[PDB]
Amino acid sequence: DAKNIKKGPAPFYPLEDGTAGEQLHKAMKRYALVPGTIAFTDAHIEVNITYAEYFEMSVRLAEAMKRYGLNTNHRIVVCSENSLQFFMPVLGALFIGVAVAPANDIYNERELLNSMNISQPTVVFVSKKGLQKILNVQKKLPIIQKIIIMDSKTDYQGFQSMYTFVTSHLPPGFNEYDFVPESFDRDKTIALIMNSSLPKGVALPHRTACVRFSHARDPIFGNQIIPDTAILSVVPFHHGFGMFTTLGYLICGFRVVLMYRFEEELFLRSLQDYKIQSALLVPTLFSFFAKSTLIDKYDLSNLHEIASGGAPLSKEVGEAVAKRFHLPGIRQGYGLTETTSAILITPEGDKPGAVGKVVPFFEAKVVDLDTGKTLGVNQRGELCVRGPMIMSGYVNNPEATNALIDKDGWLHSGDIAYWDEDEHFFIV
């Protein structure tokens, strides 16, 4: 009964062709050509980096990695707290088809080795403060040939920075605006290898990012592209919420204001002073802001939304946070690392405490817990989802993959849900 399979509507804008790197290159080149357009802002040190600067350096890294010898057969790791520099190697790799494996920068040293043992990187990009951890891992994974320091201009402790690495490998006369990103099969070529909440590696083809880019610009399931839009992001860039919201914001030309350490006054003062339209919180920051009383001391009249993304809020906490911030509700999402980003999303302007509706290109159902039979309206069962952001598989673990994703391609989320007459989903 097709009536019991919830289907996303058609996207406002048709899904664009090209790899994720080709799509990001094209958008970012355009914003690059408008001087003064801000890509990222570091709320702690107050520095802005423009799209022209971001574009040029990402293109330069792409060419430098290509000349060094990286191709679709290689992976890199990015291991860094949130920073102005984080996405530079991410974008450069995407531009040339090299898979990016972000490693949680507060992983203890065992968890870190586990993650890099699965991703098997040839090159590691790390912040200064992560260098010692990476050196210790490298003693055990000889495949790591080269370590490049992200938040330095000169060489740092005998290692090249991104800047000196680029200079070592760029051809004479290199022109950032003549560069053409690589073209490859976006279904077979892996864009990201993300870690599971021992964590596994989740392989995500370029296709899954391309679909995210359609949602991110969707006026219903995303944010409308409006000039001078600014986002405050406190979520980790190495995890799917931060990774795939930020890439979408770059596609949209927005200003991404970041923090790498949560503080109450800096956060609220940043919302006010950067006239943030949209803020992203990790889940336990919601319980925090339900307790905060300082909110009313700031002018937050440009704030239109607070988004929890993949992570599902209790109906009570979501309500208490919306109230504190004088908002009609929270822009919720439900997703997993395994679905790339949110595949249920609160449609713009529209149900307490629904998590949202099925995104374009996807289908969702709920099934009986004993039997697997599809259930009807208002009936509680296991949420299953199907669509082109589902991971291609856990790296080198077909058994955990087949345990999660059945033979018809339904991913079994492990969560309990129901959908209603309006097709809003509720996570119980």
Short mmCIF file of C-alpha atoms in Angstrom, two decimals:
data_model
loop_
_atom_site.label_atom_id
_atom_site.label_comp_id
_atom_site.label_asym_id
_atom_site.label_seq_id
_atom_site.Cartn_x
_atom_site.Cartn_y
_atom_site.Cartn_z
CA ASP A 1 0.00 0.00 0.00
CA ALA A 2 1.86 3.01 -1.40
CA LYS A 3 -0.36 5.06 0.90
CA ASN A 4 1.75 3.83 3.86
CA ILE A 5 5.12 4.77 2.27
CA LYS A 6 5.80 8.45 2.90
CA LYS A 7 7.55 10.06 -0.05
CA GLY A 8 9.41 13.35 -0.23
CA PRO A 9 8.09 15.80 -2.77
CA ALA A 10 9.94 16.92 -5.88
CA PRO A 11 12.79 19.32 -5.12
CA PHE A 12 12.16 22.97 -5.80
CA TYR A 13 15.30 22.96 -7.93
CA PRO A 14 16.11 19.83 -10.00
CA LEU A 15 19.13 17.87 -8.88
CA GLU A 16 22.21 19.35 -10.57
CA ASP A 17 24.65 17.14 -12.50
CA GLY A 18 28.34 16.89 -11.60
CA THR A 19 30.30 15.68 -8.62
CA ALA A 20 30.00 17.36 -5.18
CA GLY A 21 33.35 19.04 -5.89
CA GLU A 22 32.17 20.41 -9.26
CA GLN A 23 29.08 21.81 -7.67
CA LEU A 24 30.95 23.43 -4.74
CA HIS A 25 33.63 24.79 -7.18
CA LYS A 26 31.07 26.38 -9.39
CA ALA A 27 29.13 28.08 -6.59
CA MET A 28 32.20 29.20 -4.73
CA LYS A 29 33.85 30.62 -7.86
CA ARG A 30 30.81 32.82 -8.34
CA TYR A 31 30.89 34.21 -4.78
CA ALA A 32 34.65 34.55 -5.08
CA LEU A 33 34.09 37.00 -7.93
CA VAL A 34 32.13 39.27 -5.53
CA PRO A 35 34.78 40.90 -3.32
CA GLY A 36 34.10 41.12 0.39
CA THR A 37 31.68 38.16 0.42
CA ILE A 38 32.33 36.41 3.75
CA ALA A 39 32.61 32.60 3.90
CA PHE A 40 33.73 32.07 7.48
CA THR A 41 34.15 34.14 10.63
CA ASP A 42 35.94 33.04 13.74
CA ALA A 43 34.00 34.41 16.66
CA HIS A 44 36.92 33.91 19.07
CA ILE A 45 39.61 35.86 17.15
CA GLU A 46 37.16 37.87 15.06
CA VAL A 47 38.80 37.19 11.69
CA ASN A 48 36.80 36.93 8.46
CA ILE A 49 37.80 35.00 5.42
CA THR A 50 36.18 35.77 2.13
CA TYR A 51 34.97 33.45 -0.61
CA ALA A 52 37.71 34.67 -2.97
CA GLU A 53 40.32 33.75 -0.38
CA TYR A 54 38.59 30.42 0.43
CA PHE A 55 38.17 29.52 -3.24
CA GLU A 56 41.68 30.37 -4.22
CA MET A 57 43.29 28.43 -1.43
CA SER A 58 41.02 25.39 -1.90
CA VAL A 59 41.83 25.34 -5.63
CA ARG A 60 45.50 25.67 -4.78
CA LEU A 61 45.33 22.73 -2.39
CA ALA A 62 43.48 20.66 -4.98
CA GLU A 63 46.21 21.26 -7.59
CA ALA A 64 48.99 20.82 -5.07
CA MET A 65 47.59 17.48 -3.86
CA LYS A 66 47.12 16.36 -7.49
CA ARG A 67 50.75 17.29 -8.31
CA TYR A 68 52.00 15.62 -5.15
CA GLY A 69 50.32 12.46 -6.54
CA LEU A 70 46.93 12.07 -4.82
CA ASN A 71 44.09 10.69 -6.90
CA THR A 72 40.81 8.75 -6.42
CA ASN A 73 42.75 5.90 -4.93
CA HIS A 74 43.82 7.89 -1.92
CA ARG A 75 42.31 9.25 1.29
CA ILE A 76 43.18 12.11 3.58
CA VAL A 77 42.33 12.74 7.18
CA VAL A 78 41.36 16.13 8.52
CA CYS A 79 41.78 16.35 12.28
CA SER A 80 41.06 19.77 13.75
CA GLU A 81 38.84 21.74 16.08
CA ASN A 82 36.49 24.12 14.15
CA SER A 83 38.54 26.80 12.45
CA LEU A 84 38.81 29.14 9.46
CA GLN A 85 41.06 26.58 7.81
CA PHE A 86 39.00 23.37 8.34
CA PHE A 87 37.22 23.20 5.01
CA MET A 88 40.20 24.08 2.85
CA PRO A 89 41.58 20.55 2.56
CA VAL A 90 38.03 19.20 2.52
CA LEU A 91 37.12 21.23 -0.54
CA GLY A 92 40.51 20.72 -2.25
CA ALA A 93 40.07 16.92 -1.92
CA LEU A 94 36.47 16.99 -3.10
CA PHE A 95 37.68 18.99 -6.15
CA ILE A 96 39.97 16.09 -7.13
CA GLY A 97 38.05 13.00 -5.94
CA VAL A 98 40.20 12.20 -2.92
CA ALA A 99 38.08 10.90 -0.07
CA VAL A 100 38.09 12.93 3.11
CA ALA A 101 38.04 11.25 6.51
CA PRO A 102 37.39 13.69 9.33
CA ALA A 103 38.71 12.52 12.67
CA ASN A 104 37.17 13.77 15.90
CA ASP A 105 39.75 16.08 17.45
CA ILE A 106 38.83 15.12 21.07
CA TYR A 107 39.03 11.42 20.45
CA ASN A 108 41.46 9.99 23.00
CA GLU A 109 44.37 8.25 21.30
CA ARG A 110 42.84 4.77 20.99
CA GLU A 111 39.64 6.06 19.36
CA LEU A 112 41.81 8.13 16.98
CA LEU A 113 43.91 5.16 15.95
CA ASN A 114 40.72 3.16 15.41
CA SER A 115 39.29 5.83 13.07
CA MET A 116 42.50 6.22 11.02
CA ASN A 117 43.06 2.48 10.94
CA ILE A 118 39.70 2.26 9.07
CA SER A 119 40.27 5.28 6.77
CA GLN A 120 43.92 4.47 5.92
CA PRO A 121 45.00 7.94 4.92
CA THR A 122 48.07 8.80 2.86
CA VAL A 123 48.12 12.44 4.04
CA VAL A 124 46.96 13.91 7.34
CA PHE A 125 45.96 17.53 7.80
CA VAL A 126 45.98 18.45 11.44
CA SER A 127 45.90 21.57 13.61
CA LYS A 128 48.96 22.45 15.69
CA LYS A 129 47.31 21.10 18.86
CA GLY A 130 46.61 17.72 17.28
CA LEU A 131 50.14 17.17 15.92
CA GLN A 132 51.41 15.03 18.81
CA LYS A 133 48.41 12.76 18.60
CA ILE A 134 48.91 12.32 14.86
CA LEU A 135 52.67 11.56 15.28
CA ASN A 136 51.84 8.80 17.76
CA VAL A 137 49.25 7.30 15.43
CA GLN A 138 51.70 7.45 12.51
CA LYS A 139 54.17 5.19 14.36
CA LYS A 140 51.52 2.51 13.97
CA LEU A 141 50.04 3.23 10.55
CA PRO A 142 52.94 3.56 8.08
CA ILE A 143 50.53 4.38 5.23
CA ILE A 144 50.62 7.97 6.65
CA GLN A 145 53.44 9.49 4.48
CA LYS A 146 52.87 13.19 5.05
CA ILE A 147 51.52 15.45 7.77
CA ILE A 148 50.45 19.02 6.98
CA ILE A 149 49.68 21.66 9.62
CA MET A 150 46.45 23.57 9.04
CA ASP A 151 46.49 26.63 11.26
CA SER A 152 49.99 27.91 10.44
CA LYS A 153 51.40 30.09 7.68
CA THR A 154 55.05 28.94 7.89
CA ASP A 155 56.32 25.43 8.50
CA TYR A 156 55.61 24.32 12.07
CA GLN A 157 57.99 22.10 13.98
CA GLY A 158 59.53 20.69 10.83
CA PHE A 159 56.19 20.07 9.05
CA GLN A 160 54.78 22.06 6.14
CA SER A 161 51.72 24.19 6.52
CA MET A 162 49.01 24.18 3.82
CA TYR A 163 50.60 27.37 2.46
CA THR A 164 54.19 26.00 2.13
CA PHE A 165 52.89 22.70 0.86
CA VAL A 166 51.01 24.43 -1.91
CA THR A 167 54.08 26.51 -2.83
CA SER A 168 56.18 23.31 -3.04
CA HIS A 169 53.92 21.74 -5.63
CA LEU A 170 52.08 24.36 -7.67
CA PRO A 171 53.18 24.75 -11.25
CA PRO A 172 54.64 28.07 -12.37
CA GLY A 173 51.89 30.35 -13.58
CA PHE A 174 49.11 28.43 -11.86
CA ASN A 175 45.80 30.24 -12.25
CA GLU A 176 43.05 29.57 -9.69
CA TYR A 177 40.32 30.80 -11.99
CA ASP A 178 41.48 28.61 -14.94
CA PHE A 179 41.46 25.42 -12.75
CA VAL A 180 38.87 22.77 -13.60
CA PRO A 181 37.89 20.31 -10.88
CA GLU A 182 37.99 16.56 -11.73
CA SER A 183 35.06 14.76 -13.23
CA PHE A 184 34.30 11.22 -12.06
CA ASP A 185 31.48 8.84 -11.28
CA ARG A 186 29.70 10.47 -8.33
CA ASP A 187 28.01 7.18 -7.34
CA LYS A 188 31.22 5.20 -7.13
CA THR A 189 33.60 7.91 -5.96
CA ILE A 190 33.68 8.37 -2.19
CA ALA A 191 33.50 11.98 -0.93
CA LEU A 192 33.55 11.44 2.83
CA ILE A 193 34.29 8.70 5.27
CA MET A 194 32.53 9.66 8.49
CA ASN A 195 32.75 8.00 11.86
CA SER A 196 29.83 6.31 13.57
CA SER A 197 28.79 7.46 17.04
CA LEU A 198 34.07 0.92 18.42
CA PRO A 199 33.12 3.52 15.79
CA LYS A 200 32.91 2.34 12.16
CA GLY A 201 33.69 4.27 8.97
CA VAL A 202 30.72 5.36 6.90
CA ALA A 203 31.44 5.69 3.18
CA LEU A 204 29.47 8.40 1.47
CA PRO A 205 29.63 8.81 -2.32
CA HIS A 206 29.71 12.22 -3.94
CA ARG A 207 26.07 11.61 -4.89
CA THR A 208 24.94 11.87 -1.26
CA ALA A 209 26.45 15.35 -0.91
CA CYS A 210 24.93 16.45 -4.23
CA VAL A 211 21.43 15.51 -2.91
CA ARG A 212 22.19 17.41 0.32
CA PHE A 213 23.00 20.45 -1.78
CA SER A 214 19.54 20.25 -3.32
CA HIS A 215 17.95 20.18 0.16
CA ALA A 216 20.17 22.92 1.52
CA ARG A 217 18.98 25.46 -1.12
CA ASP A 218 15.34 24.19 -1.04
CA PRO A 219 12.96 26.98 0.15
CA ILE A 220 10.93 24.38 2.02
CA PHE A 221 13.49 21.79 3.24
CA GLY A 222 16.47 24.14 3.50
CA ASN A 223 17.24 27.86 3.64
CA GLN A 224 16.28 30.25 0.88
CA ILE A 225 19.33 31.92 -0.73
CA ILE A 226 19.12 35.54 0.55
CA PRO A 227 22.10 37.99 0.56
CA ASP A 228 23.87 38.65 3.89
CA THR A 229 22.57 35.48 5.50
CA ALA A 230 24.73 34.49 8.50
CA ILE A 231 24.76 31.26 10.50
CA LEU A 232 26.23 30.60 13.94
CA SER A 233 27.63 27.12 14.05
CA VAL A 234 28.92 25.62 17.25
CA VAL A 235 28.67 22.02 16.09
CA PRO A 236 31.71 19.93 15.24
CA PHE A 237 32.72 20.12 11.56
CA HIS A 238 34.06 16.53 11.64
CA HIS A 239 30.57 15.15 12.34
CA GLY A 240 27.70 14.94 9.80
CA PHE A 241 25.59 17.79 11.29
CA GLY A 242 28.45 20.31 10.97
CA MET A 243 29.95 18.80 7.82
CA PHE A 244 26.86 18.73 5.69
CA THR A 245 25.21 21.89 6.95
CA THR A 246 28.44 23.83 6.30
CA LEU A 247 29.00 22.46 2.80
CA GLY A 248 25.42 23.45 1.97
CA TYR A 249 25.93 26.96 3.39
CA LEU A 250 28.97 27.34 1.14
CA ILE A 251 26.84 26.26 -1.85
CA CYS A 252 24.39 29.00 -0.72
CA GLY A 253 27.02 31.74 -0.36
CA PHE A 254 26.25 32.28 3.33
CA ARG A 255 28.48 33.62 6.08
CA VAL A 256 29.43 30.81 8.51
CA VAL A 257 30.27 32.20 11.93
CA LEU A 258 32.05 29.55 13.95
CA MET A 259 32.95 28.71 17.48
CA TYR A 260 35.24 25.88 18.53
CA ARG A 261 34.48 26.19 22.28
CA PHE A 262 31.04 26.81 23.71
CA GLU A 263 30.65 29.86 26.00
CA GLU A 264 27.25 31.36 26.93
CA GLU A 265 28.02 35.10 26.58
CA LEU A 266 30.17 34.79 23.45
CA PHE A 267 27.45 32.68 21.82
CA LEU A 268 24.61 35.12 22.57
CA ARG A 269 26.71 38.22 21.84
CA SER A 270 27.70 36.62 18.51
CA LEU A 271 24.01 35.97 17.63
CA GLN A 272 23.33 39.69 18.26
CA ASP A 273 26.41 41.32 16.82
CA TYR A 274 26.66 39.18 13.65
CA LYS A 275 22.91 39.43 13.20
CA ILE A 276 22.63 35.69 12.93
CA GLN A 277 19.54 34.43 11.12
CA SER A 278 20.18 30.85 11.96
CA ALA A 279 21.94 28.95 14.81
CA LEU A 280 23.02 25.32 15.13
CA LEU A 281 23.30 23.51 18.44
CA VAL A 282 24.47 20.01 19.48
CA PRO A 283 21.64 18.25 21.44
CA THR A 284 22.91 18.83 25.05
CA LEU A 285 23.19 22.60 24.21
CA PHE A 286 19.41 22.57 24.02
CA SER A 287 19.11 21.50 27.66
CA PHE A 288 21.67 24.17 28.40
CA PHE A 289 19.67 26.95 26.74
CA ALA A 290 16.46 25.79 28.39
CA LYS A 291 18.23 26.86 31.63
CA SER A 292 19.76 30.10 30.40
CA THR A 293 18.26 33.39 31.62
CA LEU A 294 20.64 35.74 29.82
CA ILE A 295 18.89 35.50 26.46
CA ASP A 296 16.71 38.53 27.07
CA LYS A 297 19.69 40.79 27.57
CA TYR A 298 20.62 40.60 23.86
CA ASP A 299 19.04 41.90 20.72
CA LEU A 300 18.20 38.76 18.78
CA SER A 301 15.60 40.22 16.45
CA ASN A 302 17.31 38.86 13.32
CA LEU A 303 17.25 35.31 14.65
CA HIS A 304 14.71 33.34 12.67
CA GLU A 305 15.75 29.77 13.48
CA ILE A 306 17.41 27.30 15.79
CA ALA A 307 18.17 23.92 14.24
CA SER A 308 18.97 20.60 15.85
CA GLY A 309 19.52 18.79 12.51
CA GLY A 310 19.85 15.01 12.66
CA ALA A 311 19.48 14.91 16.43
CA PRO A 312 15.91 14.39 17.80
CA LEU A 313 14.79 16.65 20.66
CA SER A 314 12.37 15.89 23.45
CA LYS A 315 9.14 17.75 22.80
CA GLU A 316 9.53 19.58 26.17
CA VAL A 317 13.13 20.81 25.72
CA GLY A 318 12.40 21.98 22.15
CA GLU A 319 9.42 23.92 23.37
CA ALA A 320 11.33 25.50 26.33
CA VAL A 321 14.18 26.62 23.99
CA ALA A 322 11.81 28.05 21.34
CA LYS A 323 10.06 29.99 24.10
CA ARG A 324 13.32 31.37 25.59
CA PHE A 325 14.33 32.58 22.10
CA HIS A 326 10.81 33.87 21.26
CA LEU A 327 10.51 31.51 18.29
CA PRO A 328 7.43 29.50 17.20
CA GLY A 329 9.45 26.31 17.32
CA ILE A 330 12.73 24.55 16.57
CA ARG A 331 13.79 23.60 13.04
CA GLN A 332 14.24 19.92 13.72
CA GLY A 333 15.69 17.19 11.63
CA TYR A 334 16.20 13.48 11.94
CA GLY A 335 19.21 11.82 10.40
CA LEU A 336 22.12 9.58 11.08
CA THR A 337 25.75 9.56 9.97
CA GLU A 338 24.60 6.61 7.78
CA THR A 339 22.00 8.80 5.93
CA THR A 340 24.53 11.59 5.37
CA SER A 341 22.30 14.33 7.02
CA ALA A 342 18.70 14.91 7.91
CA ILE A 343 16.14 12.85 5.90
CA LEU A 344 13.20 14.06 7.94
CA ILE A 345 13.15 17.87 8.17
CA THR A 346 10.75 20.51 9.54
CA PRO A 347 9.31 22.18 6.51
CA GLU A 348 9.84 25.94 6.54
CA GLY A 349 7.15 27.75 8.49
CA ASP A 350 5.43 24.48 9.43
CA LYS A 351 3.54 20.72 14.34
CA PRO A 352 4.69 20.21 17.94
CA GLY A 353 6.54 17.87 18.54
CA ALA A 354 6.88 16.48 15.01
CA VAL A 355 10.47 15.97 13.87
CA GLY A 356 9.36 16.96 10.31
CA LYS A 357 8.64 15.49 6.89
CA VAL A 358 10.42 13.19 4.41
CA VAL A 359 12.91 15.13 2.28
CA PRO A 360 12.92 15.17 -1.51
CA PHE A 361 14.26 11.94 -3.13
CA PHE A 362 13.53 9.90 -0.04
CA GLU A 363 10.85 7.51 1.22
CA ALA A 364 10.12 6.59 4.85
CA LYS A 365 7.90 4.01 6.55
CA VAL A 366 7.44 2.44 9.94
CA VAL A 367 7.33 -1.32 10.36
CA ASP A 368 6.06 -3.85 12.89
CA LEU A 369 8.82 -4.73 15.41
CA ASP A 370 8.20 -8.51 15.33
CA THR A 371 7.47 -8.92 11.62
CA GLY A 372 8.76 -6.12 9.34
CA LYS A 373 5.29 -5.35 7.90
CA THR A 374 4.65 -1.77 6.85
CA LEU A 375 2.28 0.08 9.23
CA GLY A 376 -0.43 2.63 8.62
CA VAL A 377 -1.11 6.15 9.93
CA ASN A 378 -0.59 6.97 13.59
CA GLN A 379 0.85 3.48 14.22
CA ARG A 380 4.13 3.03 16.06
CA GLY A 381 6.93 0.92 14.62
CA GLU A 382 10.58 1.06 13.57
CA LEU A 383 11.46 3.91 11.25
CA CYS A 384 13.01 2.80 7.97
CA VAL A 385 14.26 5.10 5.21
CA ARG A 386 15.33 4.74 1.66
CA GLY A 387 17.00 7.16 -0.72
CA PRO A 388 20.11 8.39 -2.37
CA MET A 389 21.87 9.79 0.71
CA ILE A 390 22.07 6.39 2.33
CA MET A 391 25.72 5.39 2.75
CA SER A 392 27.25 2.96 0.27
CA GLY A 393 28.39 0.97 3.33
CA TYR A 394 30.53 0.82 6.44
CA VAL A 395 34.18 0.62 5.32
CA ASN A 396 35.43 -2.99 5.18
CA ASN A 397 32.48 -4.29 7.27
CA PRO A 398 29.84 -5.79 4.99
CA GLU A 399 28.24 -7.63 7.92
CA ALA A 400 27.43 -4.52 9.94
CA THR A 401 26.20 -3.02 6.65
CA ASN A 402 23.82 -5.88 5.81
CA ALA A 403 22.60 -5.83 9.39
CA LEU A 404 21.40 -2.20 8.94
CA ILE A 405 20.32 -1.90 5.32
CA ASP A 406 18.03 -4.70 4.01
CA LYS A 407 17.86 -6.24 0.53
CA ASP A 408 15.42 -3.60 -0.76
CA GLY A 409 17.73 -0.84 0.36
CA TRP A 410 15.72 0.20 3.46
CA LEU A 411 17.87 1.46 6.32
CA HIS A 412 16.51 0.33 9.70
CA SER A 413 17.12 3.25 11.99
CA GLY A 414 16.62 1.57 15.27
CA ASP A 415 14.26 4.35 16.31
CA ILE A 416 10.49 4.15 17.01
CA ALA A 417 8.19 6.57 15.12
CA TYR A 418 4.77 7.18 13.62
CA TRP A 419 3.54 9.42 10.89
CA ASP A 420 0.28 11.32 10.82
CA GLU A 421 -2.44 12.39 8.40
CA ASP A 422 -0.41 15.41 7.34
CA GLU A 423 2.69 13.20 6.85
CA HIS A 424 4.56 14.66 9.86
CA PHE A 425 6.78 12.16 11.61
CA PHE A 426 7.13 11.81 15.40
CA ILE A 427 10.02 10.08 17.08
CA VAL A 428 8.86 8.37 20.21
#
